[PDB]
Amino acid sequence: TSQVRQNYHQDSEKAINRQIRLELYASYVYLSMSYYFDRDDVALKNFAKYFLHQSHEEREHAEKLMKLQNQRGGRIFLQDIQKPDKDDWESGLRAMEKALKLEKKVNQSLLELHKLATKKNDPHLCDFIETHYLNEQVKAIKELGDHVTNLRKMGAPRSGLAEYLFDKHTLG
Amino acid sequence: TSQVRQNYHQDSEKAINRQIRLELYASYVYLSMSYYFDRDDVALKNFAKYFLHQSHEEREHAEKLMKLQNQRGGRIFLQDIQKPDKDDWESGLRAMEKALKLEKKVNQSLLELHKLATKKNDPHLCDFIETHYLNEQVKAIKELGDHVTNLRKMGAPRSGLAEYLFDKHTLG
Amino acid sequence: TSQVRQNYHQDSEKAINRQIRLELYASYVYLSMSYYFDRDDVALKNFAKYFLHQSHEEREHAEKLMKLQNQRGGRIFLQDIQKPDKDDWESGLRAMEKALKLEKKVNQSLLELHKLATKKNDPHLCDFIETHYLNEQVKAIKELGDHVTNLRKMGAPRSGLAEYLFDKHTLG
Amino acid sequence: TSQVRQNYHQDSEKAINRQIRLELYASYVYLSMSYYFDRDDVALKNFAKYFLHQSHEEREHAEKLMKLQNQRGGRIFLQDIQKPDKDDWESGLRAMEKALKLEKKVNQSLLELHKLATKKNDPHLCDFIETHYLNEQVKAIKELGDHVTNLRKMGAPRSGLAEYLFDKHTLG
Amino acid sequence: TSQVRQNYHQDSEKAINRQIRLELYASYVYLSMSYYFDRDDVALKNFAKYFLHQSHEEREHAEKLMKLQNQRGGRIFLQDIQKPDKDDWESGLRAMEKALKLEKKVNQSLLELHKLATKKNDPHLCDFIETHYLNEQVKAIKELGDHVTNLRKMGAPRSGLAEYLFDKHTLG
Amino acid sequence: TSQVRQNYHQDSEKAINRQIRLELYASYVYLSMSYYFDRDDVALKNFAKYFLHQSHEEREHAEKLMKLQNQRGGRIFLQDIQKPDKDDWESGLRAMEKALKLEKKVNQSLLELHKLATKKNDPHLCDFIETHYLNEQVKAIKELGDHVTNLRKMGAPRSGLAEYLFDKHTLG
Ligand SMILES: [Cl-]
Ligand SMILES: [Fe+3]
Ligand SMILES: [Fe+3]
Ligand SMILES: [Fe+3]
Ligand SMILES: [Fe+3]
Ligand SMILES: [Fe+3]
Ligand SMILES: [Fe+3]
Ligand SMILES: [Fe+3]
Ligand SMILES: [Mg+2]
Ligand SMILES: [Mg+2]
Ligand SMILES: [Mg+2]
Ligand SMILES: [Mg+2]
Ligand SMILES: [Mg+2]
Ligand SMILES: [Mg+2]
Ligand SMILES: [Mg+2]
Ligand SMILES: [Mg+2]
């Protein structure tokens, strides 16, 4: 047992490892999206920049969990980061819709982790999740919803004009 | 066929996808290493910082390859990123030795890429590898070799004093 | 034989003169395109600026080749610069498509030049072409391909709105 | 007919196209001269710089005429730019004498254009020529005459010392 | 075998040692030239400064190769630096002509080294030579040729006036 | 006989040429030492910097002697510069010990030079040696002796920790 460890259930430790993996997977999905928009036959540079930004943000989310794991005296165990579920993300709209689905899946995982921390009476872990993760997720989900809505109302994905103008005026 | 594609062999395109995966793997190994040194029972903060910087550098190496693949009209295909070979890296000296081994393995892959690019008469790809990768690897390998040497000469890994003092005076 | 000449094959010398002529031709093509967009019945001021900038760049590419010819002791022989293929470049999309074609034609010449320099074991010439020309072409080809893609997806050339909006938000 | 066209005679339009061609030819002559002085066996760097500057100015002279042609609603038609009359310009003095002859030829064409514009009662064209071109030519011709005189009085082109010192003290 | 060494042929190692020696010899030749022009009976202070500058530059060229040798895990082995072939360099012109011959001999050595690196499939070493040495040599050879030409056209070495004025206006 | 030559004995002129050679040899020994410490299997970056600085200082010592030889109307005669006695300098302590031996050998030569200058009643040469050389040698010898002492007292060369810590705290 680590000399620092106090009130840290083994189930919470294991669950924090799994959340690290999910954050690293989200980072990889956004990286994939980014370079899809960088293709010569897609060529939406601000979609590309948006998703790259989100990729680097997810890596930071993973690093903060790795730091937490050590702070609490848990031990990090890593698994493979699986490839994202698509290679070609089809359109600006479809990518935003898949990102929305991703952020809601990551939110679900974090809500399950909070419920576990609550059952194990771990208020430090509860506060960590609330402070650094839950409102970050709500804001992300709201932002992505707003983007999806505007893309649909403008005529995407059938209007390539709509995606071009969105790239310029929202993501630019 | 991409409208930009010119003098870009399918075999070179596949090889660049393999190298992307390898750079992402290297990023992941260094990330693992970094947080091993952040453990309370290891506690070498500048080893941790050093390897986190290397992890962010490798992600940049991968991103630049993704950018190249698109510039030449190839198509990115991402794969699962393998977990690192170790969970516990044993000591500062052992980590630096495994990092040296990793960087030589990445260099060998790049040298094989370059041989392929030469066989396919792709001078743009040869210059890209040379300019951005090969000297970066040579400098990394020399630096890691210097660190291993210092750590051995100081008495690591037996001497925990050695690793402490190297963390402060070389890495900090 | 010039006092400075060393390892510079006569075939290389002639090839450099051919490449000088092609770069001056490319400069003239872009000049032509630029002032087409300046017509009152076309009136896309940022397309005009974009192509004028490209014209001046190609002049610089020509001058650098003339400097190289003298550096290596070869002798410059200029020829008539042929007029561009078109007087009227039809639309912003069609001009971009023709520019893409021209930049791939220029690249193919450069790659043939590099092949010749490789066969003649002229690594200074190889490095010159790699350093100053090949990535410049790859970047120009990628940029033009992105521009074509955007104009197509926006609905050009039929939509004069697409070209107006692209002129403002991409080129301006 | 262009919507902007007013008091602009088809004979003036054609004369403007011929003048564009002549300004581009002059640009090419001076480019040739410049890189002759860059040869290792000539090696007068300030003669080389002087003539490159002049080459770039002539391109600007062409560009301003192209802008004029579109301002008036004429249509630019470009032609082949013929190679200069010499490959080797013999000496600094002989290059300056040829440049003097070129600038008089250019002036004679501009004077013929002015006479046509006068005959066709085109005061805007008359003023454009007078404002932008006629005094620029008078100044160029006077400078070149001054330079030829100096070189002759210093003892060129037999005195390689003459041309060296002129390169330093007048063109430097 | 050094722990850093990878893809570095023993013949390339030995050849890099020999190039270190040639760079140090070039440094010594320029040092000799410099202080010849410092003599009271020669007294061309800017020739003296020019060659001293070139001497210190050659030492830097040697140091960069010694660093390369270590980077690649080769071992430096030094031999005597032979005295330059003259004690009295006769004139400004004759010294520039001998410097031209020296730089072409150093260029030949570097081209032979590149051909060896190519045969041994060592693209890192090829890139090192191209990036740091080959264009440096071309520029040096061109500069020296230009100096020789001007000195000859001005009347050197029989005109001491010519050498004095060159000292002042070119090398000053 | 030089027009500047006054009270300058042929024997003093020859002795100054011998001292030039010796200073150039000292520069070369320190250059060797510097890059021994840059090896991956030695890896003491501040020993390397220290000895490279000393090498550049010795070249300055040689240049100043060359300047003196010309000031007094003597004639410089350069000789082959002998390779250093060792290729592998063994350890930081052993290098500093050999550097101490080298500086005492240079000092002995300067003391012999001064004795000669005194015998020939050359007070200008005596003052030159005193002002520029003798105290420089005394300070070098004392510094090297201090370094050797520290390294021995710390436990070098057995203790690789000692040389590491001296590199950081004294030399860095
Ligand atoms: Cl300490
Ligand atoms: Fe996240
Ligand atoms: Fe990498
Ligand atoms: Fe070009
Ligand atoms: Fe003009
Ligand atoms: Fe050199
Ligand atoms: Fe000394
Ligand atoms: Fe300390
Ligand atoms: Mg709270
Ligand atoms: Mg790195
Ligand atoms: Mg361009
Ligand atoms: Mg190559
Ligand atoms: Mg002019
Ligand atoms: Mg290169
Ligand atoms: Mg010293
Ligand atoms: Mg005294």
Features:
part of a larger assembly, 6 chains, 172 residues, mainly alpha, Ferritin, 5 helices, binds chloride ion, binds fe (iii) ion, binds magnesium ion, oxidoreductase
Could you outline the blueprint of secondary structure elements for this entry?
The structure is cut from a larger assembly and holds 6 copies of chain A (about 170 residues).
Chain A: H1 10-37, H2 45-71, H3 92-119, H4 123-154, H5 160-169
One magnesium ion binds near residues 54, 57 and 140 of chain C.
Pfam families (chains A, B, C, D, E, F): Ferritin (PF00210)
Family (chains A, B, C, D, E, F): Belongs to the ferritin family.
Organism (chains A, B, C, D, E, F): Homo sapiens
Task: Write a short abstract of this structure.
The PDB classes it as oxidoreductase. With 172 residues, chain A is an all-alpha fold.
Describe, in plain words, how this protein is organized in 3D.
Chains A, B, C, D, E, F: Fe cation 2 binds at residues 58, 103, 137. The structure is cut from a larger assembly and holds six copies of chain A (172 residues). Chain A has 172 residues and is mainly alpha-helical. In chain A, 73% of the residues lie in helices and 0% in strands. Chain A has a single domain, classed as Ferritin, core subunit, four-helix bundle (Ferritin), CATH 1.20.1260. Chains in contact: A-B, A-C, B-C, B-E, B-F, C-D, C-E, D-E, E-F. Chain A binds chain C through residues 40-43, 45, 160-161, 163-165, 168, and chain C through 142, 145-147, 149-150, 152-155, 159, 162, 165-166, 169. The structure holds chloride ion, fe (iii) ion (7 copies) and magnesium ion (8 copies). Residues 23, 26, 58, 61, 106 of chain A line the site of one fe (iii) ion.
